[PDB]
């Protein structure tokens, strides 16, 4: 049969997650896309991102250790 009984523990918090528990990444790979500026400009994409606030946005990935900051570059 397909009826299942649940047991609950409700005496005390076993852990506290950050309010930003569910966070998100942008891969470093994406800073090597010509369309980069266009993409992060999207007000639709920003609607979608705001719905996830509060959260961390981690910019990183394999390319983290193959990107060099140019203060002279455009």
């Amino acid at each position: 049969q397909d009826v299942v009984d649940l047991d609950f523990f409700t005496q005390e918090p076993l852990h506290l997650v950050s309010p930003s528990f569910l966070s998100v990444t942008i891969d470093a790979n994406l800073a090597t896309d010509p369309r980069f500026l266009i993409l992060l400009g999207s007000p639709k994409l920003r609607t979608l991102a705001r719905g996830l606030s509060p959260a961390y946005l981690r910019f990183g990935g394999t390319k983290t250790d193959f990107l060099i900051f140019d203060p002279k570059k455009e």
Binding site: D2, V3, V4, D5, L6, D7, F8, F9, T10, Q11, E12, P13, L14, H15, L16, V17, S18, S20, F21, L22, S23, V24, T25, I26, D27, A28, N29, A31, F36, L37, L39, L40, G41, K44, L45, R46, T47, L48, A49, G51, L52, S53, P54, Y56, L57, R58, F59, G60, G61, T62, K63, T64, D65, F66, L67, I68, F69, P71, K73, E74
Partner: protein, 383 residues
């Protein structure tokens, strides 16, 4: 294969503005493969970028390197955890010197234990452990190249994550007990996700289970690879349309509180249950309310009976099911039989609950996941 590559002040401002204007806290990985002769970290480039961001009034947290475990494969350089430990102290000094001295530092973004990462992380935490505000590691369940539909629905695949986490906590407890533990980059499948799997309703068993287990086992933050990008594990497609994991990630934020509790089935592999305090920011819900979420990987409906004293409470269902005809391989999802679409580019839909007959058992169809809010639960812990 992987070559150096420059980035502009515009790149940084683009990325900072996106985070700031979306209400998100940017974390920036710095190039840790810039080495002095003595194979120590060269901080000058990083020094240029701290200077720029500080001049601009940019509130940003920092990381140094991504998966140092495989710098030897990726760039023919071996960096030991001790040195990477020293390299993190060097960078932490610069943040203390800099205008944002309270700036947070996360590292070392090592891969999961099965990638022979334990030594590197233990050596890293013995050496650099003191300056980092959280330990970051990475988890993928599968190879995108070989991942099957059956893999995505397999409780034995979901369960390997439990040992990954136990192994990480073993290294950390032996070096920096009470240091916060973050999944710094994680998803279904590496190599940019499983085509027609990582971007579907089927991706949600792995995403929701990872979230339940991370919360239960003491992970404080889970960072989903990726919000947006080329990889099939993106939350948003190339046309800026939300995929099923976006709607799951949004409904989780609405209903799940920061206080982690526990649920279990009296019978425990294909029925996966998780319990937190309800997020009371929902005006619908008050302190003491419980958020249950459940995965059903059986091929039949299951009927969950709430334990005493919650058998007769009013329950709000949030059941997620694919929009056909592609079933679990669908890129569209219904909340309680209503398709989840953006009302427009400015506007998210409401997420309508479905109130259950009080004292009814909780129906969970085959290959589905659902949230249940137990109203008037009055759990003191949830205060």
């Amino acid at each position: 294969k992987f070559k150096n590559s420059t980035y502009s002040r515009s790149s940084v401002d683009v990325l900072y503005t996106f985070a700031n204007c979306s209400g998100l806290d940017l974390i920036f990985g710095l190039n840790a493969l810039l080495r002095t002769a003595d194979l120590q970290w060269n901080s000058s480039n990083a020094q240029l970028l701290l200077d720029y961001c500080s001049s601009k009034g940019y509130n940003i947290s920092w990381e140094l390197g991504n998966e140092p475990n495989s710098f030897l494969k990726k760039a023919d350089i071996f960096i030991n955890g001790s040195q990477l430990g020293e390299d993190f102290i060097q960078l932490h000094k610069l943040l203390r010197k800099s205008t944002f001295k309270n700036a947070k530092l996360y590292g070392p973004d090592v891969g999961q234990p099965r990638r022979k990462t334990a030594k590197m992380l233990k050596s890293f935490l013995k050496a650099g452990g003191e300056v980092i505000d959280s330990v970051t590691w990475h988890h993928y369940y599968l190879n995108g190249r070989t991942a099957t539909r059956e893999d995505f629905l397999n409780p034995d695949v979901l369960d390997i994550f439990i040992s990954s986490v136990q192994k990480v906590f073993q290294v950390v407890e032996s070096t920096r007990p009470g240091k916060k533990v973050w999944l710094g980059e994680t998803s279904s499948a590496y190599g940019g996700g499983a085509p027609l799997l990582s971007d579907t309703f089927a991706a949600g068993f792995m995403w929701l289970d990872k979230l339940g287990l991370s919360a239960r086992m003491g992970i404080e933050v889970v960072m989903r690879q990726v919000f947006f990008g080329a990889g099939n594990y993106h939350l948003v497609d190339e046309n800026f349309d939300p995929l099923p994991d976006y709607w799951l990630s949004l409904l989780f934020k609405k209903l799940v509180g920061t206080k982690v509790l526990m649920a279990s089935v009296q019978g425990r592999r294909k029925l996966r249950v998780y319990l937190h305090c309800t997020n009371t920011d929902n005006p619908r819900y008050k302190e003491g309310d419980l958020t249950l979420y459940a995965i059903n990987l059986h091929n039949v409906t299951k009927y969950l009976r709430l334990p005493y004293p919650f058998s007769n409470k009013q329950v709000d269902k949030y059941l997620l099911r694919p929009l056909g005809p592609h079933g679990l391989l669908s890129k569209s999802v219904q909340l309680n039989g209503l398709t989840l679409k953006m009302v427009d580019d400015q506007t998210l839909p409401p997420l309508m609950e479905k109130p259950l007959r009080p004292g009814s058992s909780l129906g969970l169809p085959a290959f589905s996941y659902s949230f249940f809010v137990i109203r008037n639960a009055k759990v003191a812990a949830c205060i």
